[PDB]
Amino acid sequence: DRGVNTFSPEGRLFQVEYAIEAIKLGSTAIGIQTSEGVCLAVEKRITSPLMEPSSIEKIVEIDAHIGCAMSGLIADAKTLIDKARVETQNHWFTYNETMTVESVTQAVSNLALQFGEEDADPGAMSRPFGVALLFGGVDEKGPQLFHMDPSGTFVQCDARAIGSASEGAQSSLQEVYHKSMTLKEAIKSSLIILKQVMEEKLNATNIELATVQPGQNFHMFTKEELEEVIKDI
Amino acid sequence: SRRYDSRTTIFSPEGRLYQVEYAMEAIGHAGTCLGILANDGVLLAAERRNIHKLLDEVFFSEKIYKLNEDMACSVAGITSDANVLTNELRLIAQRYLLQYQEPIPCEQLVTALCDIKQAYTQFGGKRPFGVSLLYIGWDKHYGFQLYQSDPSGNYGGWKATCIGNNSAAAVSMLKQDYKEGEMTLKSALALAVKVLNKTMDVSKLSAEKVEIATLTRESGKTVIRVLKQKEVEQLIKKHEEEEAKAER
Amino acid sequence: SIMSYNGGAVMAMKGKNCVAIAADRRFGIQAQMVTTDFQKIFPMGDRLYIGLAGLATDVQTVAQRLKFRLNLYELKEGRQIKPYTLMSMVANLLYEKRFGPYYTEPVIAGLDPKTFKPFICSLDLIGCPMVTDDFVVSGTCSEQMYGMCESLWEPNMDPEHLFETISQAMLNAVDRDAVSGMGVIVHVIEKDKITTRTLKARMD
Amino acid sequence: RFSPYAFNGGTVLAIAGEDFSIVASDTRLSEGFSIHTRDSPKCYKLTDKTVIGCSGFHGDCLTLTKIIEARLKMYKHSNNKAMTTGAIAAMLSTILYSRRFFPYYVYNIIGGLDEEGKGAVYSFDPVGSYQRDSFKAGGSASAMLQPLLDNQVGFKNMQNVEHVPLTLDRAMRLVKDVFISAAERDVYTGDALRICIVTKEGIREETVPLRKD
Amino acid sequence: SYDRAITVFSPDGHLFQVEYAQEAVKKGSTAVGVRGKDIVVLGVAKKSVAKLQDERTVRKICALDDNVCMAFAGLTADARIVINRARVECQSHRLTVEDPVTVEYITRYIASLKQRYTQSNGRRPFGISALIVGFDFDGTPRLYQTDPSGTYHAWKANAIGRGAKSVREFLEKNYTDDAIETDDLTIKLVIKALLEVVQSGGKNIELAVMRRDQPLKILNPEEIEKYVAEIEKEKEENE
Amino acid sequence: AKRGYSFSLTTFSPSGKLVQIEYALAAVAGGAPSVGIKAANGVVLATEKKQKSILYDERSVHKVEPITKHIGLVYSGMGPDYRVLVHRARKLAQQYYLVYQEPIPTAQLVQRVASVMQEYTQSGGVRPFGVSLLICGWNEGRPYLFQSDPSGAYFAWKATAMGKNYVNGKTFLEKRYNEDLELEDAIHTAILTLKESFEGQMTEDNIEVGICNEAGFRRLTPTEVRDYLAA
Amino acid sequence: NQYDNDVTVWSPQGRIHQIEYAMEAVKQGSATVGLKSKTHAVLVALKRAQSELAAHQKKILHVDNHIGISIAGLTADARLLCNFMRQECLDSRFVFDRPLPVSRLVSLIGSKTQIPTQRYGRRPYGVGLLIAGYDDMGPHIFQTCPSANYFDCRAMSIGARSQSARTYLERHMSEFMECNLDELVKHGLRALRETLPAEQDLTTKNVSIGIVGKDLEFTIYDDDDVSPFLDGLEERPQ
Amino acid sequence: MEYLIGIQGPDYVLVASDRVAASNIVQMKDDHDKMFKMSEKILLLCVGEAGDTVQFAEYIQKNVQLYKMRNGYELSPTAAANFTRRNLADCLRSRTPYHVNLLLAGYDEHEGPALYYMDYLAALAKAPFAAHGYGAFLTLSILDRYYTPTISRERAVELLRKCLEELQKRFILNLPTFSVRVIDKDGIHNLENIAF
Amino acid sequence: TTTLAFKFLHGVIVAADSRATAGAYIASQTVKKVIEINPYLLGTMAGGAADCSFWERLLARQCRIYELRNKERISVAAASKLLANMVYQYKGMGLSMGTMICGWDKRGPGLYYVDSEGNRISGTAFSVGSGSVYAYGVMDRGYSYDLKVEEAYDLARRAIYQATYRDAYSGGAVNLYHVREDGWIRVSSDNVADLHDKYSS
Numbered sequence A: 001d002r003g004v005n006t007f008s009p010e011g012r013l014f015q016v017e018y019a020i021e022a023i024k025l026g027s028t029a030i031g032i033q034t035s036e037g038v039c040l041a042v043e044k045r046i047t048s049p050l051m052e053p054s055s056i057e058k059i060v061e062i063d064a065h066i067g068c069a070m071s072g073l074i075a076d077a078k079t080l081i082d083k084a085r086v087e088t089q090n091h092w093f094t095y096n097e098t099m100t101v102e103s104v105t106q107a108v109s110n111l112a113l114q115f116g117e118e119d120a121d122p123g124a125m126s127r128p129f130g131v132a133l134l135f136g137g138v139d140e141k142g143p144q145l146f147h148m149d150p151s152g153t154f155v156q157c158d159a160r161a162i163g164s165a166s167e168g169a170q171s172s173l174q175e176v177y178h179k180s181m182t183l184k185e186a187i188k189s190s191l192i193i194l195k196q197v198m199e200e201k202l203n204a205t206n207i208e209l210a211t212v213q214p215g216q217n218f219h220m221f222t223k224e225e226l227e228e229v230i231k232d233i
Numbered sequence B: 001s002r003r004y005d006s007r008t009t010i011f012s013p014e015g016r017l018y019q020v021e022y023a024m025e026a027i028g029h030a031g032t033c034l035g036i037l038a039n040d041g042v043l044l045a046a047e048r049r050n051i052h053k054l055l056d057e058v059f060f061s062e063k064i065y066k067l068n069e070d071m072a073c074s075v076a077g078i079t080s081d082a083n084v085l086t087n088e089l090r091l092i093a094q095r096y097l098l099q100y101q102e103p104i105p106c107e108q109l110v111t112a113l114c115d116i117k118q119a120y121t122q123f124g125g126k127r128p129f130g131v132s133l134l135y136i137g138w139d140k141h142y143g144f145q146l147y148q149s150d151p152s153g154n155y156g157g158w159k160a161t162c163i164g165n166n167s168a169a170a171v172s173m174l175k176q177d178y179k180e181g182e183m184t185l186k187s188a189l190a191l192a193v194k195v196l197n198k199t200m201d202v203s204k205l206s207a208e209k210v211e212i213a214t215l216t217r218e219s220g221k222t223v224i225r226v227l228k229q230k231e232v233e234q235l236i237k238k239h240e241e242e243e244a245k246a247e248r
Numbered sequence C: 001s002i003m004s005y006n007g008g009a010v011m012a013m014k015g016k017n018c019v020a021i022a023a024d025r026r027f028g029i030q031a032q033m034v035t036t037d038f039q040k041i042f043p044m045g046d047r048l049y050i051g052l053a054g055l056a057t058d059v060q061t062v063a064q065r066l067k068f069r070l071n072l073y074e075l076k077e078g079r080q081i082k083p084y085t086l087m088s089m090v091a092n093l094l095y096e097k098r099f100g101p102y103y104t105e106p107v108i109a110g111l112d113p114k115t116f117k118p119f120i121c122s123l124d125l126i127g128c129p130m131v132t133d134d135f136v137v138s139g140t141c142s143e144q145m146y147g148m149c150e151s152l153w154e155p156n157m158d159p160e161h162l163f164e165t166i167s168q169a170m171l172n173a174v175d176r177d178a179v180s181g182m183g184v185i186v187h188v189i190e191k192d193k194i195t196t197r198t199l200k201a202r203m204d
Numbered sequence D: 001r002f003s004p005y006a007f008n009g010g011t012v013l014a015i016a017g018e019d020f021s022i023v024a025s026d027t028r029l030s031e032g033f034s035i036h037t038r039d040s041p042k043c044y045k046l047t048d049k050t051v052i053g054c055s056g057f058h059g060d061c062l063t064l065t066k067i068i069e070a071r072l073k074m075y076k077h078s079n080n081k082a083m084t085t086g087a088i089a090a091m092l093s094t095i096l097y098s099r100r101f102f103p104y105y106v107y108n109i110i111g112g113l114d115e116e117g118k119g120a121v122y123s124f125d126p127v128g129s130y131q132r133d134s135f136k137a138g139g140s141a142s143a144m145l146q147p148l149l150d151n152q153v154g155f156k157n158m159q160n161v162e163h164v165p166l167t168l169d170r171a172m173r174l175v176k177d178v179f180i181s182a183a184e185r186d187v188y189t190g191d192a193l194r195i196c197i198v199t200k201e202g203i204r205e206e207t208v209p210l211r212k213d
Numbered sequence E: 001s002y003d004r005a006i007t008v009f010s011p012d013g014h015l016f017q018v019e020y021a022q023e024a025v026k027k028g029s030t031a032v033g034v035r036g037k038d039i040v041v042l043g044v045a046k047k048s049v050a051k052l053q054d055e056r057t058v059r060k061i062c063a064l065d066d067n068v069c070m071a072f073a074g075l076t077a078d079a080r081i082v083i084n085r086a087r088v089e090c091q092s093h094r095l096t097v098e099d100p101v102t103v104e105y106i107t108r109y110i111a112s113l114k115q116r117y118t119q120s121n122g123r124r125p126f127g128i129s130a131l132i133v134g135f136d137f138d139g140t141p142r143l144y145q146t147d148p149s150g151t152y153h154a155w156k157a158n159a160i161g162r163g164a165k166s167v168r169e170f171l172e173k174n175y176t177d178d179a180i181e182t183d184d185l186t187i188k189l190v191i192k193a194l195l196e197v198v199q200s201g202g203k204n205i206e207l208a209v210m211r212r213d214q215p216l217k218i219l220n221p222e223e224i225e226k227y228v229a230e231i232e233k234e235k236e237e238n239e
Numbered sequence F: 001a002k003r004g005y006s007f008s009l010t011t012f013s014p015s016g017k018l019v020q021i022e023y024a025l026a027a028v029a030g031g032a033p034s035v036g037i038k039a040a041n042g043v044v045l046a047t048e049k050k051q052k053s054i055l056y057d058e059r060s061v062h063k064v065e066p067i068t069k070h071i072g073l074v075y076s077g078m079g080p081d082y083r084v085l086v087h088r089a090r091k092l093a094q095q096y097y098l099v100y101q102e103p104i105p106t107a108q109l110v111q112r113v114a115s116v117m118q119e120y121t122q123s124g125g126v127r128p129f130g131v132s133l134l135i136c137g138w139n140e141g142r143p144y145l146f147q148s149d150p151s152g153a154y155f156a157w158k159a160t161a162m163g164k165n166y167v168n169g170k171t172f173l174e175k176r177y178n179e180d181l182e183l184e185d186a187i188h189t190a191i192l193t194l195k196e197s198f199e200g201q202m203t204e205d206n207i208e209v210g211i212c213n214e215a216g217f218r219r220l221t222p223t224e225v226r227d228y229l230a231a
Numbered sequence G: 001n002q003y004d005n006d007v008t009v010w011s012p013q014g015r016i017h018q019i020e021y022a023m024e025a026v027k028q029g030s031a032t033v034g035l036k037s038k039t040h041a042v043l044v045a046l047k048r049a050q051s052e053l054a055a056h057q058k059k060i061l062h063v064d065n066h067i068g069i070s071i072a073g074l075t076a077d078a079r080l081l082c083n084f085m086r087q088e089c090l091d092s093r094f095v096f097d098r099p100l101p102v103s104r105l106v107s108l109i110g111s112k113t114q115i116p117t118q119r120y121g122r123r124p125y126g127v128g129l130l131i132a133g134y135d136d137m138g139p140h141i142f143q144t145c146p147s148a149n150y151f152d153c154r155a156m157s158i159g160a161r162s163q164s165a166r167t168y169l170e171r172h173m174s175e176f177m178e179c180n181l182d183e184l185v186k187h188g189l190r191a192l193r194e195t196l197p198a199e200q201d202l203t204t205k206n207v208s209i210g211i212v213g214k215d216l217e218f219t220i221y222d223d224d225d226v227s228p229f230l231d232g233l234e235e236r237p238q
Numbered sequence H: 001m002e003y004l005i006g007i008q009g010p011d012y013v014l015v016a017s018d019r020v021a022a023s024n025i026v027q028m029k030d031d032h033d034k035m036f037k038m039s040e041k042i043l044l045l046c047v048g049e050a051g052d053t054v055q056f057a058e059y060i061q062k063n064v065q066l067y068k069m070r071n072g073y074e075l076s077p078t079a080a081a082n083f084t085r086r087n088l089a090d091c092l093r094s095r096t097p098y099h100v101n102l103l104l105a106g107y108d109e110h111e112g113p114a115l116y117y118m119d120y121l122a123a124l125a126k127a128p129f130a131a132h133g134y135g136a137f138l139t140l141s142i143l144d145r146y147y148t149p150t151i152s153r154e155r156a157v158e159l160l161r162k163c164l165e166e167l168q169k170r171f172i173l174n175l176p177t178f179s180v181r182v183i184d185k186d187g188i189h190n191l192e193n194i195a196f
Numbered sequence I: 001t002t003t004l005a006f007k008f009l010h011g012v013i014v015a016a017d018s019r020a021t022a023g024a025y026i027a028s029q030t031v032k033k034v035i036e037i038n039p040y041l042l043g044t045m046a047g048g049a050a051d052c053s054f055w056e057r058l059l060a061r062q063c064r065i066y067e068l069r070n071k072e073r074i075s076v077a078a079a080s081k082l083l084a085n086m087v088y089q090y091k092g093m094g095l096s097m098g099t100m101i102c103g104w105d106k107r108g109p110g111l112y113y114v115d116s117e118g119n120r121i122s123g124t125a126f127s128v129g130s131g132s133v134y135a136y137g138v139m140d141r142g143y144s145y146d147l148k149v150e151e152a153y154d155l156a157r158r159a160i161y162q163a164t165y166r167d168a169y170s171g172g173a174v175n176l177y178h179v180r181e182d183g184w185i186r187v188s189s190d191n192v193a194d195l196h197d198k199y200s201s
C-alpha cells in the first residue's frame, strides 16, 4: 500500500496509469476533424430496454462553437464539463469574445493532476479523473479536434478514437481518413467504424452524433436525422 | 503515517463497515437494557453492572439518563462514549427549545444524534461511538414512544425492544408475551421482570441488580420516575409467585 | 434613551419567610401602547423567579438564553439551582456581552432550596450583582419606585403585609411614569404556595 | 485625515478614421498650482493595433498601465494570440470595476484598429462604464474639446454640409487645433502635444509645442 | 484535517470502494418504481419488519418537495443524510431561482453529491441507490435512479436492492401500454413485481402513489390488501 | 514543519474490545498502590511512595495533589500522565468557579475530567492515559470518593484500592471497612490497606496521605504521618 | 523495495528512490537539444506522435520575451512549472520594470522544486527542462531536474536516446562560442538527429526550434517556419 | 407607506394588508401582496425595508417548508412565531440587521386561533388585535372601541371595514385596495378585496 | 435616464433613451440601455452606468450557464431573482441601479422590476429613471390592453420623448423593442430631434 502521488520505477504515476485503464472499460467514442467541420460520435451501450436512451448524454455542448465527447466513468466528467462551461463564460465576460478550442482543452487539462493527500485543501481531489475527452469545435484556426486523457496531456488530432475498442477503431480511422474528405463522408465513416466495434446492433436510439461547423453552431442529431445515415449501411 | 492508519471509515470487500460491526460486538458484552411501550406510559429496564458492595451510590441512576422534560434514555455499550452522546442529546433538546419555544419531538432528537453517529462512520478517520441507546418519551404528535439507536447511526421505533447482553434471547421473549394495543404499565412492568430473569445468568435477580424507570402522562405534565429498591423488590416477588403458580 | 424605548418596571421585596416580585404589564413602543398583558417575570425553578426590565427584545432574549443554561445545569447537577448560583449565572451571561450588552437590568426574587431563606438581587446590563435585605428595583421609574419602598418597607412582613407593600409601592410609582403601567402583576413566593395576583390599576 | 488621491491634470483625445486611429494628449503633469514636469505624454502603446491614454490621478494611471501590461502577457501565453482592441477594452472594464468601492481616479481612452482593419475608439469612466464611439475626449479639458468635435466630425447642428469621410490630414489638423484652443483656457493643459497614429504599418509619434504658462 | 485518500484506482482500473458500496445496496431492501402516463408509483419489498417495530418510522419512501419523492436501497443511515441534503437543496433552489425544483435537477444534485464522495480526501462513498420520482410543470411524468458512483439515468421502470436482477427482467416482459393504461393497473405492475421476491406481501409491502394533481399518498395495509385479491382472481382465471 | 495524525489509534477489535484501553489498564495495574476511603465525616487518600535510592528528595514531587480548596487527587500508573490531568482538573475547577462563584461539586469535576480521558481514546493520533484517578472532595456537607479510569468512565466508591494488589486491596477493604468509620479510624485502615501490599517496612517519608473534610482538603504533614504510623 | 514509496524515506544506501524514479520520466519523453553561442541561445526539440494520425506533441513553451523552455517528462507538471516561471518574470517586470536575470529564475525553480522532495505525501516534479535565455551576461542554457539540482551548461540534451546527442555536442563544443546564428541552429539539429534510428531523420513535422538572443526575442519555429533551417541538410554518415 | 392589521375571534384569525407598492412619489404596483404562506394554516405578513422584507419573510418561509418535509407535519403558530423571532433577534446585533415589522397569524390543531405582533427589534407579543404602519395610529383606537373576544367573522369584517374607511378619510396616503384573508380549521381563505 | 416597459395583447414593449450624464455634463447620447440577454430575454438599465452594465452582463453570463446546465431557457422570474439576490449582498454599499427584466416564459409574457435597494416586483407596466415621473404621465393616459402593435409603438416612443422634454438628464434617441412569443425584435431607433419634427404635425 502506497500514496496517490507515487512514481513507478518506469517514471509514470500509478494512479494516473490505472486511470487510463478505466477508459478501457468505458464505451467507445470517435471524433473526426474536417475542412467542413468536426463530428463527434459515441455508443450509449444501453443495458436495459426500460432505460430511457435520451438520458444517457455522452456528447454535451460547452458553448455554441464547442462540443465534447467523453468515455470511461461518466460521473467524473460532469465536474470537468462544468468547469469548461464556466471558463468559456468567464472568458466572454472579461474579453467579450469566444474562447478558442485549444484554450478550453488546456484549461481542463490543468485540473487533471490536481489530486493529493497531504498539503491539500478542504475541498481537494483524492484521485485523477477516470475520463478521456474529445473536444470538437470551430474558432479562428477553423474546425479543430482535441484529445485529452487523465495524465493531463492534450493534443490536436485529425481523427481519434477512445474507449473499450479504441485499438481497432483507430486503425480503421487510419485506413479511411484523409485530409480532403467532407463532413458527410466523416459522419458516414465514423458510424461504420462504430457499428463494427459495437456488441449491440447500431440503431437510431443506440448512438449519439453531433457536429460543429463554420456554417452553424453545435447541433446534436435527432432520431430522424440519425436514421438518415443509419439507412446507409 | 499511512502505515499507522487502520482506516476506520472504509468499506469491506463484502460491502460492510467493519468498525461498526466490531462496535456492535461491544454492545453485546454490556448490561442488558430493554424498553416496553404501554397504553398509559412507557418504561426502561436495565441490568446494573456496577454491582459491588463497596460502591457508594451517589447518582439517581447508573444507566438511565434524563434528557428533557418529556424524554429519557438508557445506554448499552462503552459507558464513557455514552456520556458524550447523552450530554449532546441534552444540548440538542435545549437548542430546539430555545428556537421554537416548545419541547423537541422524540423522533427529532433521535435523528439529530444519529446524524452525528453516522458522520463518525463516513468521514474523519475516527472510531465510531460504541453505544446503542434506547429512548422513551412523549410529545404532542405521536404520544408515548420508544426508539432504538445503533453505532452506525441507524435508528428505529419499537413497541418493545432490547439491547445489550442476550439481546437476541430477550427480543424473542418479548415477541411472545407482548400484546399490541393491550399492554398497560402494570402488564409491561411484569413483562420486564420476566425477560430480565431469564437473560440474567445469575437467576436470582435482586433489586440491586436491576434498574427500572417509568414515563407517565400525569395531569397535563410528563412524569419521569425511577423506581427505588422497595418498589423493584415488590415487582420481583410478584413474578416469583408465577414460578410457584406452575405447581398446579 | 434606549432603556426608555419600551419602558417597564420590575420590583422585588423581601418578607418574613417569603419574597414578592412585581412588574407592570404594558408593552409599548415609545408613546404607543401595543399590548396590555406582557410577561416580564419568568419562573426559573418553582420557588425562584426573575423579572427583566428594559428593551423588550433583550428581556425575551435573556430570559430564554438563561433557561437554556439553567436546564443544562439542573440536568448536569442532580439538584435544582440556588438563588446565589442563578445570580452568578446571570452576571456571567450579561458580562459576555460586555462591549455590546443586552439592554436589560434583571431582578431576581426567590427562596433558597432546603434552607427556605428569602433572597433578592438586582443586576447591571453588564451583570453587576447587588444583594439587599430590603428591596431591589429596575426600570424607567427607578426614582419613583425607590421613594415608595424606602418609606413603606418594614423589617418582618407576613405574606399578606408584604403583598400590600409591594402592590402599593408599584402602583403609586407607576402612576407618575408615562411609559409604565396598564396593570401590575405580583407574585408572592412562599415555601408551600405561590400567590399570583393582577391588581386594579389605572389604564392611562 | 490622509487623502489617497491627487488631481494631476492631463487631457486625452482619440479620433477613429476608416483606416487609422489617432490618440493624442498634452504632456503636462501638475499638482495644486505647480507643475511636476513638462514632459509626460499620457498616450501609451500596448500592441501593434492598440494604444491607450490615461489621465487624472497619475498614481493610479501608472499602476493600471502596469497591470494591463502584465495581463496582456498573461493572455499571450494562455491563448497564443495578441489581445485585440475590443478584448482589451472589455478587460479594462472589469479591472476598473474590481476597484468599485475604492475607484481608480482615471479617465481612459483606448484607440486602435478592429478585426476588419477599421479605426476604433473606446471611452471609459473611472469605474468601468464604456462604449465604442467615433471620437472622444476625456480629462480636465474634455468639456472644451468635445463640442468642437461634435460640430466638425459629427456635423451636428449644421444644415447643408456634404458629410465627407475623415481623412488623416483633416483629423490630424483637428487634434492640433482643439488642443491649442484648450491650452488658452484650461490651466492644466499645455507645454506640448503628443499624437499617436495607429495604422496598418504600426504606431507613429508626433510632437507639437504648446503654451507653457 | 483528515486528508486520506479512501477511494483509489486499482491495477485493473477499478474503484473498489465504489464497487463495495454497490455491494451494500445489493444487500438492501428491494425497491421498484414504474412510470405510467398519469401517475408514478414506487414500492419497497424485502421488509421482514419484526411486527414489534413501529412501521411508520422505518418507511423507505420519502418526500423531498411538494412534487418530488424518492425511495432507496442499502445503508438506511446513509440515505437519511442524502435525503436531508436533497430536501435542503429543494428549498435552496426556491430561494435563488424562485422556481420549484425539477425532477432531473434534484437527481443531478444527489448524483453529484455521491460522486463528490468518491473523489474526496477522508470521505467514504454513499452506500445507497435512489429512485427519484416526480412531475415537471409541463405535464410529463419522470422516473430517475442514482447509484454510489454518481451516475444517473431515466427509467420507464426500474428495480434496485435485493434480487434487483429478478424484478428487472420481470418488468422487461410485463411493461407494455396495456399494463400502464389506468391508475389501478400501473399500481398492479409494482405489486406483481414485488410478489416475485417477497413471500406473499400485503403486510410486507410498502408502496406510495403520486399524481400531478395531489401530493404523495402512502397506501395503508387495507388498500394494499385489495390489490392482493384483485390480481388473485386474475391469476386464478386459467380455467 | 508539523501537523498531526487525524485518525484514531484506539479501535475496536473483531472480538469487540478497545484493545488500547485494556492495555492502558495494564499500566495502572502495574503502578504503585493507592487507596481511598470515604469516612462519612471526611475522606482519606493514601499512596505508596517508594523512593528507591535515598538520593531522591521526597518532598520535591508529590503524588497526592490538590485541585482546589476542597478537592484532592491521587493516581495509580504513569506519573507524567497524571500530571497533565492534574493541570486540566485544576483549570476545569476554575472555569466553574468563575461562572457560578461556588466551589465545584466533586461529581461535576469528575465528570468533566473523565470527558478529557474519553477524548484521548477517540481523538486523532493519541493514546489513552495510563492512569486511574482517585478524586475526593467535600461539598454540600457531604464527603465524596470517585474513581476515573483510562476509558473515561467514573465510579463512586465508599472505599477502593488501585495499582499493585488492587484485588488484595479491595478484599481487605470490604472485610475491614464499614460505613461508619470516623476520619481518624479511616486513616488507620487506609495505611493498613497499604501495609497489606507494602513489603519494605513503612516510614513517614515512604507513604503520602491526604485528608478532606469540612475544613477543606490538605496533605498530611510528615510529622502527622509519623504519629499515625504508631499503630 | 520497501524504501521506494515516499520521498521522505531514505534508503540505507543514502538515496531517495522516489526522486530517482521521477528522473526516469525525463528519459521517457523525446530528446531536446539546448546550445548557446556568444549572442544566441537555441532550443531544438524532437516531437512525439502518439499515432501519426494525430499531431506531434508541443515541446517548446514561452516564458517571457527573453526566456523560453523545452520540456521533457510529464506535460501537466511542465505547464505547472511554466506558469510559475511566467509569474516570477511578470512580477519582476511589474516591480523593477526590467527582465528577471535567467540565473535568478533558475534559482527560484530550485527553491520551488526542493519543497515537495522533503514533505510527506508529496512528489517531485516529473519534468526536466532546458532553459534558453538572454540577459546582461549574454545567452544562457540551463538544465533542471526532478531533483531541485540545476546546471549552468555550455550545451545539453535530455530525453529518450539523448546519449547520442551528448557525444556530438561534446566533440563540436569548441566551435560553439565563435559560431554564427545560422550554423548554431544547424549544430542543434545535427545533435537532435543522432537521437533517431537510422531509418528516417529530421522533418517539418517533428522538429521545433526556439531561438533567443541579442537580435530577437524568444520565437518558436514549428512547421513552415522550420523548413528554411532544414534546407542545407547533410545526410547521415553513420 | 405600508399597512397591516389582524383581528382574532374565537376560532378564526382575520388579516388584511394594502396592495400598494410605492417608490418616492409614485405607485409602481396596484396589486402587491404582503402576505406569505408558511403552512396550510399560517400566514406571515411582512412590512418594512425595501430589500429586507422579501429576503427575510422568504427565508423563514422555505425553512418552515423544510420542516414540513423533514418531519412530515407542520409547525404550530406558536413555534413559527418563535422561529421567526429567533432569526430576527440574532441578526439584530450582526452586520446585516433586517428592518422588518411583521405580523404572524395562524390556527393550531389544539390551541386554536393565534395572532402575533413583532417589532423590527424582534419583540414578540400575542394580541387579540394588532396593526402596523402609520395607519395603525388611526385604526388601533377603533379596534379598542368595537372589539369583544366573542366577535363573529362577519362582524369582524365590518370592524375591519370601519378601519379601512378611516384610512380613506384621515390618512394622507392613497391606499385604494386591501388583501383580505381568514385562517381557521379548514386553512387559509381568500376574501373579496376591499376597494375604494 | 428614462426607461419604460409594458405588456399588452400582442406582447411586451421596451423603450429607453440614450443619454449618459456625468453631473451636469452630457457624456454620451448613443448608449444602448437595453441589454440582449437571450433571443427572448431583455434587460433595461438606469442609474450608475458602470453598475448597470456590469451586473446585467454578469446576469447574461449566469443565464447562459443555466441554459447549458439544464438544457432549458431560464424563466423571467428566475432571471430576475438571480439579479435581485446578487445585488442584495451589496445593499448599503452605494450601488445604484433600477432595472426591468422582461421576456417570454412558459407562464407567458413576464415583466419584473429590480432595485439596488432589493426590490423585486412583477407588474404589467413600469417606468424607471430620472424622467420616470414624466413617462408615466402619457403612458397611462394613452394605455389600453387592446392597443394595436403600431399604436403600442407610438405610446412608448412618445412617452420617452415627453420625458426628454421635461427631464434634463434624459435625451439622445428613443430605442424600441417588441417581445413576442418567438422572441424580441428591434423596432426603431429615432433621434429626439427627428421625432420633435414629426410630433409637431
Ligand SMILES: *[C@@](C)(CO)[C@](*)(O)[C@H](Cc1ccccc1)NC(=O)[C@H](Cc1ccc(OC)cc1)NC(=O)[C@H](C)NC(=O)CN1CCOCC1
Pocket: D103, D125, D126, D127, D129, I001, I002, I019, I020, I021, I022, I023, I027, I031, I033, I045, I046, I047, I048, I049, I050, I052, I053, I094, I095, I096, I129, I130, I169, I170
Ligand atoms: C440617466 C441618463 C441619468 O440618471 C441614466 O440613469 C443613466 C443610465 C445609463 C446606463 C448605462 C450607460 C449610460 C447611462 N445613468 C447615467 O448616465 C449615470 C448617472 C449617475 C451617476 C452616479 C450615480 O451614482 C453611482 C448614479 C447615476 N452616469 C454615470 O454613471 C457616469 C457615466 N459615471 C460617473 O459618474 C463616474 N462614477 C464616479 C464614481 O462613482 C460611480 C460613478
